[PDB]
C-alpha cells in the first residue's frame, strides 16, 4: 500500500503491470531468519503449475 507522493500504490503498479499476478501473505513467512536480532521477512515468487504439454 506504500504510495509514491502522487498516489500510485505498489498494488496499483502490480495491477497495471502484472494484472493476473496471484498475491498471498502468510504469517509463517514473517521472521524466517534472524540477522542478529531482527527477524528477517521473506518474499517468494514462484510459478504455481507448469503445463504438461511442452515437456
Amino acid at each position: 500500500s506504500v504510495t509514491t507522493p502522487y498516489g500510485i500504490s505498489v498494488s496499483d503498479w502490480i495491477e497495471q503491470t502484472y494484472p493476473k499476478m496471484r498475491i498471498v501473505s502468510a504469517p509463517e513467512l514473517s521472521g524466517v531468519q534472524m540477522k542478529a536480532q531482527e527477524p528477517e521477512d521473506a518474499l517468494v515468487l514462484f510459478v504455481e503449475d507448469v503445463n504438461a504439454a511442452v515437456d
Binding site: 498494488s11 502490480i14 495491477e15 497495471q16 494484472p19 493476473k20 499476478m21 496471484r22 498475491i23 498471498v24
Partner: protein, 41 residues
C-alpha cells in the same frame, strides 16, 4: 463435480489477483459456463 471443482479452484485463484486480472478471469469462467450451456442444448 469436476467442473464445480475447476470453477471453485479458479475462483480461489482469481480472488487474490489484482482487479483487472480478477475481472478477466471471472469473465473467462462465465464464458466457459456459457459455452458449456450452449453445448448442452
Amino acid at each position: 463435480a469436476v467442473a464445480a471443482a475447476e470453477s471453485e479452484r479458479q475462483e480461489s485463484a482469481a480472488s487474490e489477483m489484482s482487479g483487472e486480472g480478477e475481472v478477466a478471469e471471472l469473465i473467462s469462467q462465465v464464458k466457459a459456463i456459457l459455452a458449456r450451456l450452449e453445448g448442452t442444448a
